[PDB]
Amino acid sequence: MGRVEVRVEFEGDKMRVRLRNDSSTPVEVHIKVGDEKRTVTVNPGEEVEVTFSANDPHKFNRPQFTIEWG
Amino acid sequence: MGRVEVRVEFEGDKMRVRLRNDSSTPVEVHIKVGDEKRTVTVNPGEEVEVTFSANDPHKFNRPQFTIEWGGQRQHF
């Protein structure tokens, strides 16, 4: 059982990724935006917001995220 | 155990979301973009594309995704 929520917000030169872990085990989230990679662990019931900046808005045209558990 | 991959592509008036399920159980993906919700089940080892259209590009400014596993094959 379990569910993970990912909200992506685009505001000016920034991209905010809000992550909610609504499962009973920690999850690992890998986020790739162009040449920038970021990995965070989200614990059960924890909300983690990761912000990316960019010198040009075109950098956020292909965001990728991977959710891992267990 | 398990991992799910989500790739978001913004091309013209469309937003394509490629979903890969690398776990041993089916996962359910809910995507909300403005006034439009799309839900698909992704089976182990499969890739599913979900495409959204819009009359204006600002509709894709706040996409939301929910990944669910270990349910009753209907809403989890």
Side-chain angles (χ1 to χ4, degrees):
Chain A
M1 340 301 184
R3 89 210 272 270
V4 178
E5 296 173 19
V6 182
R7 187 195 65 194
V8 185
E9 181 192 357
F10 296 102
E11 180 171 9
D13 48 25
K14 293 156 160 84
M15 182 188 79
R16 299 183 189 87
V17 184
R18 189 191 65 186
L19 308 159
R20 298 171 171 191
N21 181 3
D22 299 302
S23 61
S24 50
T25 62
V27 313
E28 182 155 300
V29 183
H30 304 257
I31 313 173
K32 185 202 184 125
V33 211
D35 64 0
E36 188 171 328
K37 283 177 183 178
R38 185 73 134 85
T39 299
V40 290
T41 290
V42 194
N43 283 347
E46 185 187 43
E47 183 184 297
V48 179
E49 192 181 76
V50 189
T51 305
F52 291 78
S53 279
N55 262 73
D56 96 317
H58 246 333
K59 189 201 178 208
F60 308 134
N61 275 194
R62 261 177 104 104
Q64 189 173 129
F65 55 95
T66 304
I67 291 111
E68 305 181 309
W69 64 94
Chain B
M1 321 87 173
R3 89 208 211 95
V4 177
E5 298 175 15
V6 180
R7 289 164 157 89
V8 188
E9 181 193 3
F10 295 103
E11 183 174 7
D13 49 28
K14 292 157 161 81
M15 182 188 78
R16 294 175 167 100
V17 181
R18 281 240 76 167
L19 306 160
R20 184 155 173 89
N21 181 4
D22 296 301
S23 60
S24 50
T25 62
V27 313
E28 182 154 302
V29 185
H30 304 256
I31 310 171
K32 186 202 186 256
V33 213
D35 67 356
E36 190 172 325
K37 286 180 183 179
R38 290 186 176 257
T39 297
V40 286
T41 288
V42 194
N43 283 347
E46 306 298 331
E47 282 170 23
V48 176
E49 194 160 288
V50 186
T51 307
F52 293 78
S53 281
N55 254 229
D56 177 80
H58 313 318
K59 187 201 177 207
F60 309 134
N61 72 160
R62 259 181 203 115
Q64 291 189 207
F65 315 75
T66 307
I67 290 109
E68 303 179 310
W69 65 93
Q72 301 286 265
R73 308 297 250 271
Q74 307 292 346
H75 193 244
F76 228 50

